[PDB]
């Protein structure tokens, strides 16, 4: 019952949980802090992001292993195997979906509306795009189409704000563009848009590098844009 807990205690426990590599706990503590209804700081956004991305990242890795086993089994096409791996893949998928729904609920109920500056609004809209993207990876059929559109809409609104309000080297803007380029290539089957977005992002960032303190963070994301461009070439 975190409703009655001191906000500062929840943040301290999230940092403890991070040091102990207890990411489910860390995420629950940050959910409780969000629910206090105050805006987050930069450090708190890092704690929230790191906690939920560790949880969902582990689930996504597990789902990928199980989906591959499932497909391999089905292709062999033996009269006798496949039901167990399908059922367990479904179990992991359901848990993944639940975590993504929790994050999207926090963004919708507390974080996006309440953000008081462009930088933080862009961060939260990127996060919304990312968690719909993770839902899209496991979705099928008509649900998949709706989810893909939801991701696209969040990323595009984030991109619209970032272009008007933030420098091209800003790491939130860079990470947003990187992730939206991945959406284009891996989810929306739009390699042309992926490549175009990645190249524009990289080039516009490079032009302003001479101004930076910040340099480490910006240049790291720029390298990943370049790695993707090489892969997509």
């Amino acid at each position: 019952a975190m409703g009655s807990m001191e906000r500062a205690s929840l943040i301290q426990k999230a940092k403890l949980a991070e040091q102990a590599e207890r990411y489910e706990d860390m995420a629950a503590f940050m959910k409780g802090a969000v629910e206090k209804g105050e805006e987050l700081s930069c450090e708190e956004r890092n704690l929230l992001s790191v906690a939920y991305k560790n949880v969902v990242g582990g689930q996504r890795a597990a789902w990928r292993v199980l989906s591959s086993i499932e497909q391999k089994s089905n292709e062999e096409g033996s009269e006798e195997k496949g039901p167990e791996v399908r059922e367990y893949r479904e179990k992991v998928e359901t848990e993944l979906q639940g975590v993504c729904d929790t994050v999207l609920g926090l963004l919708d109920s507390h974080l996006i509306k309440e953000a008081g500056d462009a930088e933080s609004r862009v961060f939260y809209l990127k996060m919304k795009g990312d968690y719909y993207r993770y839902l899209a990876e496991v979705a099928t059929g008509d649900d998949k189409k709706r989810i893909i559109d939801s991701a696209r809409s969040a990323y595009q609104e984030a991109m619209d704000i970032s272009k008007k309000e933030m420098p091209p080297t800003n790491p939130i803007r860079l990470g947003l563009a990187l992730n939206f380029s991945v959406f284009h290539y891996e989810i929306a089957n739009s390699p042309e848009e992926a490549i175009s977005l990645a190249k524009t992002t990289f080039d516009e960032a490079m032009a302003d590098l001479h101004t930076l303190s910040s340099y480490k963070d910006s240049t790291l994301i720029m390298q990943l844009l370049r790695d993707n461009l090489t892969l997509w070439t």
Partner: peptide, 11 residues
């Protein structure tokens, strides 16, 4: 083989 997205590190 999979594209790389933004890493899970403190910025």
């Amino acid at each position: 083989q999979r594209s790389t997205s933004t890493p899970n590190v403190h910025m």
